[PDB]
Amino acid sequence: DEAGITGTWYNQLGSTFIVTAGADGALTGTYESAVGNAESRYVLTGRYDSAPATDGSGTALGWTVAWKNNYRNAHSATTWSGQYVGGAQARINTQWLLTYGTTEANAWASTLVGHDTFTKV
């Protein structure tokens, strides 16, 4: 799925995920969030299954963004875990975890959970 994954994707919030899938299972690119304490692009890296099952299952992948770039530092990181589903209406269906740096006393409240669906349109 190297060719299927590589490219520009967009989620239901309007965010823009720009990724390149390597032959070796790497994911590299940039993310730009339409919401939250974010502006412009941020580095991302991640990994995907480069030899998925051939039975119609999706392709497992994940990636991370730390929310620091030249413009802002939100002292936080998001990880997306999901699967690519190929075809005419290709999708990446994810669940994510956003952790903010906290004191020990506040660590119970450190982590948001949600779900993003990415399309090529």
Tokens representing residue 105 in the block: 């006393």
Instruction: Report if residue 95 touches its own copies, rule: CB under 8 A.
Output: yes
42 known ligand binder: yes
Hey, which residues between 29 and 48 contact its own copies (CB under 8 A)? 35-36, 43-48
Among 9, 17, 64, 118, binds its own copies (CB under 8 A): 64
CB of 18 to its own copies, least distance (A): 15
9 known ligand binder: no
- Which residue stretches of the chain are H helix? 2-5
Instruction: Report if residue 121 touches its own copies, rule: CB under 8 A.
Output: no
Burial code of 13-44, b = ≥16 C-beta within 10 A, e = fewer?
Answer: eebebebebeeeeebebbbbbeeeebeebbeb
Instruction: Report if residue 119 touches its own copies, rule: CB under 8 A.
Output: no
Instruction: Report if residue 63 touches its own copies, rule: CB under 8 A.
Output: yes
For the chain, the farthest-separated pair of C-alpha atoms sits apart, in whole angstroms, at: 48
Cβ-in-10-Å burial (0-12, 13-18, 19+) of 104 comes to exposed
CB of 73 to its own copies, least distance (A): 6
Binding annotation for biotin: 31, 42, 80, 96, 108
